[PDB]
Design a protein around this ligand. Structure first.
Ligand SMILES: CC(=O)N[C@@H]1[C@@H](O)[C@H](O)[C@@H](CO)O[C@@H]1O
Ligand SMILES: [Cl-]
Ligand SMILES: [Cl-]
Ligand SMILES: [Cl-]
Ligand SMILES: [Cl-]
Ligand SMILES: [Cl-]
Ligand code: NA
Length: 129
């Protein structure tokens, strides 16, 4: 599923991301826009053989099991396929564990390089929330 901006903001808010560990909703929407272009079906293979899955491009090296990342962890205790659902619950519940891990949203390279220190509120401007 390809989310609209305001549609994803409302879904993230419903699932408890707005100000989760101090990160305003705009941060999460901005991160999804630059990680996946709001596409729940987004996959990208890393140089190390790990793969990033879903709207927040969560990595099989640490967070989910795809059966093809030797020596990796499954810290969210989910198959990576669950992160590709039209329903964002699995991606949101895993995002909560990641952002609590000590490095906050710096775990999302696109957030660090394209969202961090920007006017992230623009991503939820005009939305019914
Ligand atoms: C929290 C999370 O899994 N972030 C991943 C990161 O590990 C990976 O390196 C990158 C791919 O380049 O996409 C995402 O930002
Ligand atoms: Cl947009
Ligand atoms: Cl915001
Ligand atoms: Cl594996
Ligand atoms: Cl949803
Ligand atoms: Cl933080
Ligand atoms: Na894994």
């Amino acid at each position: 599923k390809v989310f609209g901006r305001c549609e994803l903001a409302a879904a993230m808010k419903r699932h408890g991301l707005d100000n989760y560990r101090g990160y305003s909703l705009g941060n999460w929407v901005c991160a999804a826009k630059f990680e996946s272009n709001f596409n729940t079906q987004a996959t990208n293979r890393n140089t190390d053989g790990s793969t990033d899955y879903g709207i927040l491009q969560i990595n099989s090296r640490w967070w989910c099991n795809d059966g093809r990342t030797p020596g990796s962890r499954n810290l969210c205790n989910i198959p990576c396929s669950a992160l590709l659902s039209s329903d964002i619950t699995a991606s949101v519940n895993c995002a909560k564990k990641i952002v609590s891990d000590g490095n906050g949203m710096n775990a999302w390279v696109a957030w660090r390089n394209r969202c961090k220190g920007t006017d992230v509120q623009a991503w939820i401007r005009g939305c019914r929330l």
